[PDB]
Structure 1
Amino acid sequence: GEEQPRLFELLGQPGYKATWHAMFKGESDVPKWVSDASGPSSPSTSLSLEGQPYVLANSCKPHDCGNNRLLVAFRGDKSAAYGLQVSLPDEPAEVMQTPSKYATYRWYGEPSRQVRELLMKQLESDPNWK
């Protein structure tokens, strides 16, 4: 794996910007923060999945970061992107303990099961995520 720019940085580049835009074609009721994907973001990673390259990026909703997470997998060649939006409720307190049991997921780009799993692994890289 190799460090890559953060999502807001990637999306400033003409190539990633265009692939991202294309991902939302035909989608309805997409929150502005998701299509913008301009909020806090930790470093991305380029890696391989069974010999196919992806750039795995993340962001979260400004000022509601823990409860609103975005994970993205761009193909290495930038020809397609796949996305995962994670939503957590505010209550009960145990959401913080086992967020996986409370989360609602929305998928973008019609990812395969294997790409879905790759995106879940990125989410699960947070040591508090369980």
Structure 2
Amino acid sequence: DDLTISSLAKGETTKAAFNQMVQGHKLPAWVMKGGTYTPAQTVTLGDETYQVMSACKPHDCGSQRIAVMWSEKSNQMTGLFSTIDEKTSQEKLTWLNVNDALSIDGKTVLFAALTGSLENHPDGFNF
């Protein structure tokens, strides 16, 4: 049982937190179903530890993806949804339930989870 955004959304103790994260947003069905994912990674911001994970749309991975950071300590879940338009070199971001504590370095970590810098430099984001 790998920790994934999908498992958090269905988890008895985490489902409520996931619902709060996506409140007001209408995400594609692939997110809850469970997209193409990689292992969660530990990131420490201040004195708070988070599990940071990401997933992408199956078989259309470079087009749509999502990153989530989860704090068991606070139960809170914050995320970033991203859709890409290669032809215009553009990327549309939807910030999901970003509280003030994560408004600067949290956004940076979520973006790093999507670019690949967090996976390539696992110890470079503990701000």
TM-score normalised according to structure 2 size: 0.74
Q: Which amino acid is 1:5 matched to?
A: L
CA distance in 2, matches of 1:80, 1:37: 21
CA contact 2:56–2:64 (8 Å) conserved in 1 = yes
Q: Which amino acid is 1:70 matched to?
A: I
Pair 37,104 (structure 1): closer, same or farther in 2 beyond 3 Å: farther
1:68 aligns with 2:59: no
- Which residue does the alignment assign to 1:24? 22
- Stretches of 4+ moved more than 6 A in 1? none
Range that drifts further, 32-41 or 78-87: 32-41
- Which residue does the alignment assign to 1:91? 87
CA contact 1:68–1:86 (8 Å) conserved in 2 = yes
5+ residue gaps, structure 1, are: 96-101
Alignment map for 1:51-62 (pairs within 5 Å): 51-62=47-58
1:122 aligns with 2:120: no
5+ residue gaps, structure 2, are: 120-127
Kindly tell me the number of residue pairs found equivalent between the two proteins. 114
TM-score normalised according to structure 1 size: 0.73
Q: Which amino acid is 1:45 matched to?
A: Q
Alignment RMSD: 2.4
Q: Which amino acid is 2:15 matched to?
A: K
